[PDB]
Amino acid sequence: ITGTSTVGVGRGVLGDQKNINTTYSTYYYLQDNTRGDGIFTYDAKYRTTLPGSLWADADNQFFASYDAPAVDAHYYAGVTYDYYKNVHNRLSYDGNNAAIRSSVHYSQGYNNAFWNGSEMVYGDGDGQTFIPLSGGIDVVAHELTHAVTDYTAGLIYQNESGAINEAISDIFGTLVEFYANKNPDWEIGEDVYTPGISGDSLRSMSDPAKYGDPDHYSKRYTGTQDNGGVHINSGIINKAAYLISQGGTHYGVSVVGIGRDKLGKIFYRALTQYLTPTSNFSQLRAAAVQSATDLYGSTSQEVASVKQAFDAVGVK
Numbered sequence: 267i268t269g270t271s272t273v274g275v276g277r278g279v280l281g282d283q284k285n286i287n288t289t290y291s292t293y294y295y296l297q298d299n300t301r302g303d304g305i306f307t308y309d310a311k312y313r314t315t316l317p318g319s320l321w322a323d324a325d326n327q328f329f330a331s332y333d334a335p336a337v338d339a340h341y342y343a344g345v346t347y348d349y350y351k352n353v354h355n356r357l358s359y360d361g362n363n364a365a366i367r368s369s370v371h372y373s374q375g376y377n378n379a380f381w382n383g384s385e386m387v388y389g390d391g392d393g394q395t396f397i398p399l400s401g402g403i404d405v406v407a408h409e410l411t412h413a414v415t416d417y418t419a420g421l422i423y424q425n426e427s428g429a430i431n432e433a434i435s436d437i438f439g440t441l442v443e444f445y446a447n448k449n450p451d452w453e454i455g456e457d458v459y460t461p462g463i464s465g466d467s468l469r470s471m472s473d474p475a476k477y478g479d480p481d482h483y484s485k486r487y488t489g490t491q492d493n494g495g496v497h498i499n500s501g502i503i504n505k506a507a508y509l510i511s512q513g514g515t516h517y518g519v520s521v522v523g524i525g526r527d528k529l530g531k532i533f534y535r536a537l538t539q540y541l542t543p544t545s546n547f548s549q550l551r552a553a554a555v556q557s558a559t560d561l562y563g564s565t566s567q568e569v570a571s572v573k574q575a576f577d578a579v580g581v582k
């Protein structure tokens with residue numbers, strides 16, 4: 267919409283108060299004109315038609331419980347855009363400031379959120395397995411990171427390249443969660459998963475086996491479910507990225523950690539310069555080694571740690 271940029275206030279899914287960028291033109295819309303070609307949030311009104319209606323509000327105050335998921339989808343897409351711009355110098359997901367669109371209230375009792383190739387979509391959850399999925403900043407950044415991958419490596423969604431594609435989304439979702447300093451951790455989706463159980467999450471990067479996902483290449487899933495295990499075998503790469511950052515000894519192999527910032531620089535470089543649509547785990551290892559070589563030198567500690575981490579999860 268064409269109108270005047272302004273700032274409204276609301277409450278997110280977890281009850282926290284936040285300011286959001288809106289546009290005024292008769293109604294106040296969830297349209298943030300301060301980032302790129304804009305961030306736009308739509309109401310899918312419990313249907314599956316997309317994108318639905320651009321979210322309109324009469325007084326620029328978003329404290330209704332129906333407003334919550336829209337507030338957080340809108341706000342956390344702004345934080346993800348800032349992370350990619352300020353840390354990696356990338357303007358939106360295509361690198362040319364493409365508008366970011368999200369729809370919330372998709373379907374009824376829908377336990378998922380996803381990047382469909384053109385925009386983000388978030389269910390409200392059934393209230394037991396999940397609460398509205400846009401309340402998790404790691405979920406929002408995970409999905410939007412699929413858009414970055416689609417415009418760069420283009421990793422196909424199946425078998426090892428799809429597992430890499432999912433791991434990349436977990437890694438960057440976790441880095442965004444650390445960047446916003448929102449009670450950060452190495453788990454995925456803990457803010458919106460099972461509101462009645464404390465301490466759990468959908469997946470763990472620090473110990474993927476806690477939920478039964480593989481943490482070593484010898485335990486990979488070789489069947490056909492989940493497109494060849496894209497959400498299961500991503501644990502092998504998640505564990506490797508956790509080790510590179512944090513260090514540790516895993517199946518007898520010791521890794522010195524180099525921290526999150528270098529982790530993010532190496533993987534972003536590998537993603538935007540060396541991975542291709544059909545890259546497999548062994549090609550990911552070579553891409554990450556080369557990236558760390560480019561940035562820090564072939565005899566750096568950083569290259570050494572990337573090798574040890576992939577050796578520790580059995581990826582040669």
Ligand SMILES: [Ca+2]
Pocket residue numbers: 323324325326327328329
């Ligand atoms: Ca209102």
Ligand SMILES: [Ca+2]
Pocket residue numbers: 443448449450451456457
């Ligand atoms: Ca957290």
Ligand SMILES: [Ca+2]
Pocket residue numbers: 404440443450451452453454455456
């Ligand atoms: Ca998390």
Ligand SMILES: [Ca+2]
Pocket residue numbers: 456459460461462463464465466467
């Ligand atoms: Ca829980």
Ligand SMILES: [Zn+2]
Pocket residue numbers: 408409412431432435
């Ligand atoms: Zn994903």
